[PDB]
Design a protein around this nucleic acid. Structure first.
Ligand SMILES: Nc1ncnc2c1ncn2[C@@H]1O[C@H](COP(=O)(O)OP(=O)(O)OP(=O)(O)O)[C@@H](O)[C@H]1O
Ligand SMILES: Nc1ncnc2c1ncn2[C@@H]1O[C@H](COP(=O)(O)OP(=O)(O)O)[C@@H](O)[C@H]1O
Ligand SMILES: Nc1ncnc2c1ncn2[C@@H]1O[C@H](COP(=O)(O)OP(=O)(O)O)[C@@H](O)[C@H]1O
Ligand SMILES: [Mg+2]
Ligand SMILES: [Zn+2]
Ligand SMILES: [Zn+2]
Ligand SMILES: [Zn+2]
Lengths: 97, 338, 502, 592
DNA sequence: AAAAAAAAA
């Protein structure tokens, strides 16, 4: 599990980022690296928590994101030439070409 | 508390209890006959008027530097005091306390450790204040004959100058200036509210090794209001109260902008060029009986500074120079010098 | 017991919802404000309704308006029932059962924070102040459904409070709910929740007294409507919040002086004392501090004036004359500023190379010849415009900076004036006295439209799409006509090439 | 006790109807207060009664009630309030306004003012009088008075009164038709509450003779006493003493052997003139006397006093829409060697003005980290706090560098913006500046020009409204005059009347300039433009800046501001041009 | 409470 912030290029200027928690199951381990901007497709879920209710005084629920796919978006912002999680991967026919 | 009383909601006698421990637990039911009846008749409540109380105070005492063995750190001791002897002692005095040396349980900390180790304290029984008494020159017959003798002595100030610091040789005029500093100048205001202070500010210049520091120490000894400070070394001497963050509850007790006994005090400083910008700002703020009004958290309890400033300093060269003397000056702004 | 008072106020409420029938203008014979509103929700599928308090004022005088405003917490469910009754009388498929909300606005007066007293608890109120901090948009349980585990019966619609409450019985006769319940997440309905903080303005606060602070809770569609630093006006109901810690919870359990108004003697409290504090609940927030899309905003004047000033013959001759009427002379500067406001097309290559599509203008001249007036006018006219000086006291300066609390895990960047001036016009005064860092960051800021930094383990690439306008004072005070621009100015050559007009 | 209930009430009622302060007059040895003040309350609708102990002490039957009140304050006060409640009907014989309002008393001057350094346990639950200074306050604390319960099965509700905080919960619903024991659950938002507030107070510094530290005593207030004081107030309070056991461990029912001490108080004390204006305002030589009145001890220096007084008067402010706002503030600099007593003028003007902050060489808003409470609060600066007034700055040269730029944006725009910690906002300042500076060196050499000696940026110096110079030069005559004047001081002045006149002028007077003065303004501008060139093509310095025009306009408008005039005359413009060119004539360097 | 690394003045 990992802590996810807001991209500095997407946040409105002069504001504060928003934090969330991302959970990675098998085969997703160590795919992401610290400091690397990423894009995660996942499932939104909520669960009960004690001290969150204790300090807020209302039945509020914590939320986490169970990741399903990760795509790296560091540097190469051009994201319209082709589709897929990894644009640097080739098929067999592309290798033949 | 000594005896704790509860009222019984108009049910016969009002139950009493006494607890000599440092902890206390309350009652739930009462021995009143109609309350002892098989159904409840009123909840017992503690009564503040009917109870008996006693004054309580605590203090700690430190070892003298003469009694400390070499290469050690002095230890402390807690003292409890109760009764009419409360407030018979003040911080900063040598005393001869006699009391009962009693053990105290560790269970108040509630750690469930130190099965046999316990804390100890002394309960005061008799205090000899000792030390000396200032007495605020309260007039007595003997000192009246003393001042008659002084009247017969003729001219006094020359002998007073000769008699302050005989260990330091010569420098009669400096001692005369010290005498004139001790008495103070014209004070107690003038017409239409204009401010004038009786305090005299004298700055001494000289090379190292002229016994000006020793003279300052002698002056501080002879002046009961004298205080010695310097640039840092100790932090709680300037711009901050001595009680800041002091209480165990951390109540943030503070006056705001104040100095050490600056009200009618004699402030003595060595290495007047050493202090940083903060103490320089403070000494510039205490100019001409001006109060210090530095605020940090809405506090404005200003200390009315009415003090005489005596400072000693040296040029950075360490020796006098044939060139223009203001080039040596104090290495301080000319406004402060004037 | 039937609260006939609640029933009566609900009946009156639904009645004037039915037939308020106020007329706006002569053409608006009978307009039916709330029937039009319900049609609006029908055609746009909304959930909240807006009620003007003044429109509520004259209906049954104080027997209705005051009876609703004062005991608002007492009669809120009755008003909800009346609204549901009328909406299901007039629009069943809108219910597709949904959390209807009511926001009252236009109160007769507003109260200061220092005027808050406990006698108004549970009454409608309007307050205003500066928002200083908000929180995330968290889901909150509203109506829970539970499974009776030992028999797997369903108990639902369990209302909640400040504490997470489970049911207390099972309708199944063979069951006696000895075991507890398990919450059905997919059956329960949540609602949005955000906490914001407000404080007194500098106007109301006398002397050097400490500002009074209060906590406001939002709910529903009013989330993220009060950004920090904004002076806003909140309308809602005053409430009180207890300490849930002393209350029974499944989880484990200035201030040291105590003396709080505690209460003891209850069942669930045990030997604990319950404390309270004042917090505010809000329901209405207001603030007091493609060519086809534009053509869609249709009006008679919109068509007429636009067509008139498009088919005119001398727009330009008039247009430059319409810029900054206050200033005197300086004909060319007005045209230059107008062209700067108009801007240039932004294009991108097929391989991803970006082209600068804005105009950068510098103004030079001897002192006092009305050069700052243009900057002030463009700041006051151009949207998203920021005024700034060449030398800034902040560590951000012009572009950005990195800051961290001492031994505190922040590692956050702070935005400079250029960062705030995105998609707008940045106006810098006294351009001459910048320092090395900004002087070398700028000639990357303009040409590339982006800023990059990598310090102390954090790296990022920020957008800086800005149009810059600067003023300068020639060296020596007065411009020397004998020399040239390079001779008189001390600003560097690479910065000169960046600018487009002088 | 069971003694005061019967006869003390009747005795005090008899002396309520039969009291005359002539008894106190005879006691002093140099009139029916109660009934007249009671009728005043009847015709006013206010429910508040003040009561002094000395007048209560003036009667022989009442001093017994005095002693009984000292020992048992609560019951005596309650029975007194009931007596006053009955006094309504006793004196009116509308009975509708009486039934709604309660009645309370405010005893004061019961005992001598004591100190926190001598508080024996013998003085518990006894009325005492205390002076001190408020340190900190707290927000209003709700206090339960009526508990609300509901039988959720049948939705039946009832009101339960409380006593001593402890609530006796009902174990079974009163509706025996259901009679369920566990169907009650209270409603927090349908109860009734009282507004308690806690005040922290410190002793006066007069009680500490030998450099000791002050001590703090907590306070408790209710109802009308809420927010009756704020930080820094000097007040005197009269109330009873209270002692409470501390909870220690909230988990258990164990209690400490020491009790917390706090006091509960009931009374707190602190520590058509327009005709008089026009009579003064109509006088001819009011200008000179008014100028000389603001500095009685200052010898000569008349012109600078006139300038400072006119700055205090201030010009007009306008915010026309299509052009924007124009500055109405006046900013003045003083320069000279530290032998002028120029700090005294700043100290004078700081207290003469209604609003104004006196500081030294932080000055604006910064987000602060709260000390006692763990939260983040935005705090405004000194310059923001001087809105509409005059901000006094001393030691202007030692201003560092970061703050100077701040000034550079507070004068040309009069609106400061802060962007920190996610907070973006703008604050209005609209403040005047009166600053003083010292030259570099022991003396300001006349040969050297001003810029080098003051060590200020030329633009900041140029953007001031005016500037004044003081040059003490040794001469026999002036030294003799100063010696005589200061020795005589060592051996016609108005009052806050000045402050109210200033407030009236700032509020109700909005003068405008007229077409007659426009020609004189243009002629003066040309005249100083005419002097800006000579018989040589050197292109002499252009001293006739537009800043001169705005300075003249503001000075003239302020000259119409005082004397309660509504339109300007010539005297305004000649005064403005003379007072603006007097400083310019002394602004030259060694050449010319 | 005291030592050690980082960016801005
Ligand atoms: N006139 C004197 N008579 C006797 N002893 C003197 C005299 N002048 C200096 N001394 C000696 O000088 C020493 C104290 O002077 P000291 O150097 O401490 O003072 P200082 O000039 O303030 O210098 P520094 O700043 O170096 O401490 C003592 O050892 C003392 O005996
Ligand atoms: N319509 C106008 N025509 C000419 N000058 C003007 C006009 N309006 C204002 N001014 C002057 O121009 C100045 C604008 O500031 P600026 O040109 O930046 O001079 P400075 O550099 O001294 O601030 C103002 O001080 C004002 O006196
Ligand atoms: N004209 C004067 N009248 C009365 N006192 C004066 C006069 N000129 C100087 N003084 C005295 O000299 C001092 C001058 O100090 P000042 O120049 O105000 O110091 P600073 O300006 O550095 O605060 C004052 O304290 C004042 O008592
Ligand atoms: Mg020495
Ligand atoms: Zn009983
Ligand atoms: Zn069941
Ligand atoms: Zn029931």
């Amino acid at each position: 599990r990992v802590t996810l912030q807001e991209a500095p290029g997407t946040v409105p200027p002069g504001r504060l980022p928003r934090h969330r928690e991302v959970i990675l199951l098998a085969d997703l381990v160590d795919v992401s690296k610290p400091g690397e901007e990423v894009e995660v497709t996942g499932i939104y879920k909520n669960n009960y928590d004690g001290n969150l209710n204790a300090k807020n005084g209302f039945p509020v629920f914590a939320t986490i994101i169970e990741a399903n796919s990760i795509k790296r978006r560091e540097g190469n912002t051009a994201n319209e030439g082709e589709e897929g999680l990894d644009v640097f991967s080739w098929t067999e026919e592309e290798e033949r070409e | 508390v000594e005896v704790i009383a509860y009222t019984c909601d108009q049910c016969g006698y009002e139950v009493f209890q006494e607890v000599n421990s440092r902890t206390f637990t309350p009652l739930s039911e009462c021995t009143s006959e109609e309350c002892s009846q098989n159904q409840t008749k009123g909840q017992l409540f503690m009564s503040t008027r009917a109870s008996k109380f006693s004054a309580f105070q605590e203090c700690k005492i430190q070892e003298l530097s003469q009694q400390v063995p070499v290469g050690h750190i002095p230890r402390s001791l807690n003292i409890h005091v109760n009764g009419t002897l409360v407030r018979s002692l003040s911080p900063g005095d040598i005393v001869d306390v006699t009391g009962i040396f009693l053990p105290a349980p560790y269970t108040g900390f509630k750690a469930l450790k130190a099965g046999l180790l316990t804390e100890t304290y002394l309960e005061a029984q008799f205090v000899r204040q000792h030390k000396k008494k200032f007495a605020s020159f309260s007039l007595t017959s003997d000192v009246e004959e003393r001042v008659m003798e002084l009247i017969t002595s003729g001219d006094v100030y020359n002998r007073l100058a000769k008699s302050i610091a005989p260990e330091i040789y010569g420098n009669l005029d400096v001692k005369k200036a010290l005498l004139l500093l001790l008495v103070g100048g014209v004070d107690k205001r003038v017409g239409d509210g204009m401010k004038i202070r009786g305090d005299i500010n004298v700055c001494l210049m000289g090379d190292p090794g002229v016994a000006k520091s020793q003279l300052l120490k002698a002056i501080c000894k002879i002046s009961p209001r004298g205080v010695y400070t310097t640039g840092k070394g100790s932090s709680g001497v300037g711009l901050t109260a001595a009680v800041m963050k002091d209480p165990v509850t951390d109540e943030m007790i503070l006056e705001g902008g104040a100095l050490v006994l600056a009200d009618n005090g004699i402030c003595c400083i060595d290495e007047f060029d050493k202090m940083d910008e903060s103490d320089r700002t403070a000494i510039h703020e205490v100019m001409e009986q001006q109060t210090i009004s530095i605020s940090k958290a809405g506090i404005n309890t200003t200390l009315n500074a009415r003090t005489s400033i005596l400072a000693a300093a040296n040029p950075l060269y360490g020796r006098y120079n044939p060139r223009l003397s203001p080039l040596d000056n104090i290495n301080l702004p000319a406004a402060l010098l004037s | 017991v039937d609260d006939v008072t609640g029933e009566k106020v609900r009946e009156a409420f639904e009645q004037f919802l039915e037939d308020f029938s106020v007329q706006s203008t002569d053409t608006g014979e009978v307009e039916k404000v709330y029937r039009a509103q319900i049609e609006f929700m029908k055609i746009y599928d909304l959930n909240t309704i807006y009620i003007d308090y003044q429109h509520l004022s004259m209906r049954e005088n104080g027997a209705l308006a005051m009876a609703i405003s004062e005991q608002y917490y007492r009669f809120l469910p009755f008003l909800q029932k009346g609204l549901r009754r009328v909406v299901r009388k007039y629009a069943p498929e809108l219910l597709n059962e949904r959390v209807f909300q009511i926001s009252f606005f236009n109160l007769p007066t507003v109260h200061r924070i220092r005027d808050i007293r406990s006698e108004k608890i549970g009454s409608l109120l309007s307050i205003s102040g500066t928002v200083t901090r908000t929180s995330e948009v968290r889901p909150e349980l509203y109506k829970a459904s539970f499974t009776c585990d030992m028999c797997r019966a369903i108990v639902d619609n369990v209302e909640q409070s400040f504490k997470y409450t489970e049911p207390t019985f099972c309708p199944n006769p063979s069951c006696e709910n000895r075991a507890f319940w398990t919450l059905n997440v997919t059956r329960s309905r949540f609602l949005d929740w955000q906490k914001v903080r407000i404080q007194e303005n500098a106007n109301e606060i006398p002397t050097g007294s400490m500002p009074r602070t209060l906590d406001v809770i939002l709910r529903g569609d009013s989330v993220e409507r009060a950004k920090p630093g904004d002076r806003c006006k909140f309308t809602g109901v005053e409430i009180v919040v207890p300490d849930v810690t002393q209350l029974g919870l499944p989880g484990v359990k200035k201030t040291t002086e105590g003396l709080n108004s505690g209460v003891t003697g209850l069942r669930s409290l045990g030997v604990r004392d319950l404390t309270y504090k004042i917090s505010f609940l809000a329901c209405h927030v207001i603030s007091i501090g493609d060519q086809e899309v534009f053509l869609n905003s249709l009006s008679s004047d919109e068509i007429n004036e636009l067509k008139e000033m498009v088919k005119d013959e001398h727009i330009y001759d008039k247009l430059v004359r319409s810029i900054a009427p206050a200033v005197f002379g300086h004909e060319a500067v007005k045209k230059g500023i107008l062209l700067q406001m108009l801007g240039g097309v932004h294009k991108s290559t097929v391989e991803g190379i970006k082209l600068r599509g804005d105009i950068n203008i510098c103004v030079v001249g001897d002192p006092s010849t009305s050069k700052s007036q243009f900057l002030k006018y463009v700041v006051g006219f151009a949207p998203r415009s920021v005024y700034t000086s060449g030398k800034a006291s902040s560590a951000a300066g012009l572009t950005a900076a990195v800051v961290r609390d001492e031994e505190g895990g922040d590692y956050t960047i702070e935005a400079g004036a250029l960062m705030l001036a995105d998609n707008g016009i940045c106006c810098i005064d006294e351009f001459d006295k910048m320092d090395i860092s900004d002087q070398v960051a700028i000639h990357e800021a303009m040409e590339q439209q982006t800023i990059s930094i990598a310090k102390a383990g954090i790296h990022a690439t920020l957008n800086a799409r800005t149009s810059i306008l600067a003023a300068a004072n020639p060296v020596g005070g007065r411009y020397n006509r004998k020399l040239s621009l390079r001779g008189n100015l001390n600003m560097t050559a690479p910065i000169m090439s960046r600018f487009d007009l002088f | 006790t069971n003694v005061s209930i019967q006869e003390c009430t009747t005795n005090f009622r008899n002396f309520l109807m039969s009291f005359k302060y002539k008894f106190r007059k005879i006691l002093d040895e140099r009139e029916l207060y109660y009934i007249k003040q009671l009728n005043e309350m009847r015709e006013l609708g206010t429910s508040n009664l003040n009561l002094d102990a000395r007048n209560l002490l003036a009667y022989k039957q009442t001093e017994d009630l005095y002693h009984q009140l000292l020992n048992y304050p609560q019951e005596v006060i309650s029975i007194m309030d009931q007596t006053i409640k009955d006094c309504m009907v006793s004196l009116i014989v509308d009975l509708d306004e009486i039934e709604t309002k309660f009645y309370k008393v405010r005893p004061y001057n019961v005992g001598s003012c004591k100190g926190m350094r001598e508080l024996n346990p013998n003085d518990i639950d006894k009325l005492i009088n205390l002076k001190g200074l408020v340190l900190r306050s707290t927000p209003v604390i709700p206090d339960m008075k009526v508990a609300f319960f509901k039988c959720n099965v049948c939705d039946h509700t009832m009101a339960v009164e409380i006593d001593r905080g402890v609530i006796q919960e009902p174990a079974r619903c009163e509706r025996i038709d259901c009679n369920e024991p566990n169907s009650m659950s209270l409603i927090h938002n349908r109860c009734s509450f009282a507004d308690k507030q806690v005040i922290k107070l410190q002793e006066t510094p007069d009680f500490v003779p030998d450099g000791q530290t002050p001590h703090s005593i907590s306070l408790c207030v209710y109802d009308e006493l809420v927010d009756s004081c704020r930080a820094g107030d000097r007040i005197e309070v009269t109330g009873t003493f209270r002692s409470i056991p501390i909870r220690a461990n909230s988990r258990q029912r164990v209690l400490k052997s020491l009790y917390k001490t706090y006091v509960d108080v009931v009374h707190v004390k602190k520590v058509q003139d327009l005709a008089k204006i026009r009579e003064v305002a109509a006088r001819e030589d009011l200008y000179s006397l008014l100028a000389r009145s603001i500095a009685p001890s200052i010898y000569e220096l008349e012109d600078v006093k006139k300038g400072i007084l006119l700055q205090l008067f201030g010009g007009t402010n306008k915010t026309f829409t299509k052009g924007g706002r124009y500055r109405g503030d006046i900013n003045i600099l003083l320069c000279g060697d530290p032998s002028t007593s120029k700090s005294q003028i700043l100290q004078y003007v700081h207290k003469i003005t209604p609003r104004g902050v006196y500081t030294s060489g932080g000055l604006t808003a910064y987000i602060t980290r709260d000390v006692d409470t763990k939260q983040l609060v935005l705090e405004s600066g000194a310059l923001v706090l001087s809105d509409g007034g005059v901000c006094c700055i001393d030691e202007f040269d030692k201003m560092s560098d970061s703050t100077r730029s701040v000034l550079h944006e507070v004068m040309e725009q009069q609106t400061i913006s802060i962007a920190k910690a996610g907070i973006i906002t703008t604050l209005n300042a609209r403040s005047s500046i009166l600053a003083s500076a010292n030259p570099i060196g022991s003396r300001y050499n006349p040969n050297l020009p001003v810029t080098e000696n003051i060590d200020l940026p030329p633009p900041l110096l140029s953007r001031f409204d005016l500037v004044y110079l003081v040059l003490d030069k040794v001469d026999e005559k002036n030294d003799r005059e100063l010696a005589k004047h200061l020795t005589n001081l060592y051996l016609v002045l108005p009052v806050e009347f000045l402050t109210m006149y200033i407030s009236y002028a700032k509020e109700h007077i909005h003068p405008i300039i007229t077409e007659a003065a426009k020609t004189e303004l243009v002629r003066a501008y040309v005249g100083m433009r005419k002097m800006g060139d000579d018989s040589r093509s050197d292109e002499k310095r252009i001293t006739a800046t537009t800043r001169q025009l705005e300075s003249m306009i503001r000075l003239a408008e302020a000259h119409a501001k005082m004397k309660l005039k509504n339109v300007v005359e010539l005297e305004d413009v000649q005064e403005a041009v003379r007072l603006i060119r007097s400083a310019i004539k002394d602004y030259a360097t060694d050449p010319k």
